[PDB]
Amino acid sequence: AIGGPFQLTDQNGKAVTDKSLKGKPTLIFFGYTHCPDVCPTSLFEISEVLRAMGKDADKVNAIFISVDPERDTPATMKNYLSSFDPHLEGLSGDPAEIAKVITSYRVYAKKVPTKDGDYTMDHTALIYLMDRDGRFVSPFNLKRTPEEAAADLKRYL
């Protein structure tokens, strides 16, 4: 199965758990705060889905989880998310807790060094759709307009 228990911290220092996400459909995706191109693209796309949700953006969860726990903090996540929709949650935590999530969500994450202490993370770029019971449905298709994606997500409310 996909998904398991966790307790992490959002960009405002608030605890977020698998349990706290239940009741609303959830879009989960993985990245980190040194991720040019790939992560801004998905953050942008999810932001536009959230915009397309209108007044119902608060009826879904939109969750961006670190795969680089050593560098990703609530403050670094807050800065990384600042241009994006304010309903996005950027989650950080201890490397052992993030590793548990990587396992349970079947996430690919691997460090790719460059030089001088810099590195990127090769990682899963797909978006996870979890239903209102926290059960995996499918990857979430963003190869369409944000209105078309939101119309799909709305059926899980």
Domains of the chain: 1-157 (3.40.30.10)
Q: List binding-site positions for Cu cation.
A: 35, 39, 123
Q: List binding-site positions.
A: 35, 39, 123
Give dist(CA 13, CA 129) in Å, integer: 25
Q: Which amino acid is residue 7, in one-letter code?
A: Q
| Resolution value, angstrom units | 1.3
Q: List binding-site positions for Cu(2+).
A: 35, 39, 123
Q: What is the DSSP string of the chain?
A: ------EEE-TTS-EEEHHHHTTS-EEEEEE-TT-TTHHHHHHHHHHHHHHHTGGGGGGSEEEEEES-TTT--HHHHHHHHTTS-TT-EEEB--HHHHHHHHHHTT--EEEEE-STT-EEEEE--PPEEE-TTS-EEEEPP-SS-HHHHHHHHHTT-
